[PDB]
Structures are given as C-alpha cells and as structure tokens.
Structure 1
C-alpha cells in the first residue's frame, strides 16, 4: 500500500483498538451503523451516517486525499455519536475520547 494508506490505517487502527483502563474497546459500538430498520431514529437525526467500517473502506479505496479528509470523517462519526447519544452517557463521552485519540495518533504517525 502507498505511504499515506499505511499512515491512515495505523491512525484508524489506534482509534479502533483503543481500550480504557478496564480493557473496554471504546470503538466497538461505532464499528457498524445500526440498520435503518433496527434504529430508524438514528437516520432521522443523522444526515450523513458513517461508521469505522466505512472509514476503513474509504482508506482502502484511497478516497481520502489527505489526513485532513480522514480527520473530517472521524470528526463526523464522533459528531454523529454526540448528536444521537445522550449527553453525559458512556457512548457520548467515549466519542469525545476517540476524537482526542485520533488527533494524538495523527500527530504520532504523521
């Protein structure tokens, strides 16, 4: 894979595999979007749904032209998670943590 592809894969893998001190993987509920039939209220509130599988697909198929493009989609995922999930809830807070994990990973790798 090209250099930029390896960098994005390492950045997103750091975010995906991030665990809290108890070993809980924060990204697990964000890997795959709920189906429209299982959670229609998700699609009523979220205009541009995205999950970590979609982000990995966009890295794999070279859809991000820069690290900034990758960041925009990770920030969109976190923004969608904060929009849908209750403020103060574990999922809402986990998406704030993952924004910071992404930013530190982007700086560490590139």
Structure 2
C-alpha cells in the first residue's frame, strides 16, 4: 500500500476523534504549526516543532519510511503540546486522548 496512503488514512481517522461535549476534532490544534512571527516564544522552547501537515509531507519526501518513524514523529508532536500547555487544559486533554487513539492504532497495524 505505501507509507503515505496508509498515513493518510490514519490522519483521516484521527480527524474523526471528537471531543465528547463540544464535538470539536481533537486534531484541530495539531493541524498546522503556529506562525513564528506571531508566536516567537514557542520556537525558542520546542526543539522539534511538529504538526499533522508536516507528518504527511514527511511520509512522501523520504523522511519517514516506516510506521515506527511516523509514531515517533507523533510522539514528539504530543510531547510538545503537553510540555507547552497546562495540564488539564483542552490542548493537553486533546493530546492525551488523541495519543491514546494513535497508540491503539499502531498496535492493530504492526
């Protein structure tokens, strides 16, 4: 099937994970990186900024060739949000719930 299409389908499932009260997709804060001009402090903290759009592109330019590399990239994406955002805040909650889902997804595939 190829790494990119498999990941593309992973991302689609991820986008259907919805918060239970307001139904917002837990992927929402993870879709793209914040703009560096408007959020310069974020990029002095976060060593490896990571978002969903970069993950998909890295699955078709040779950067990620295995699902384990993809899961590792998702891990630092989640770690950055947990590091940056207060425990119990909605961004932190979305990271935990979305990570739980991707973790279960990687077991059912390899």
- Across the aligned residues of Structure 1 and Structure 2, the Cα RMSD in angstroms comes to 1.6
Q: TM-score, normalised by structure 1?
A: 0.87
Q: CA deviation at 1:51?
A: 0.7
**Cα distance in structure 2, aligned partners of 1:107 and 1:8:** 14
* Contact 2:14/2:102, CA 8 A, preserved across alignment: yes
For the residue of structure 1 that corresponds to 2:108, the secondary structure is helix
Distance 1:62-1:19 versus aligned 2 partners, 3 A rule: farther
For the residue of structure 2 that corresponds to 1:63, the secondary structure is coil
Bigger mean CA offset, 59-68 vs 43-52: 59-68
Q: Which structure has greater helix proportion?
A: 1
Higher relative contact order (CA 8 A, sep 6+): 1
Aligned residues: 109
1:88 matches 2:73: no
Q: CA deviation at 1:77?
A: 0.4
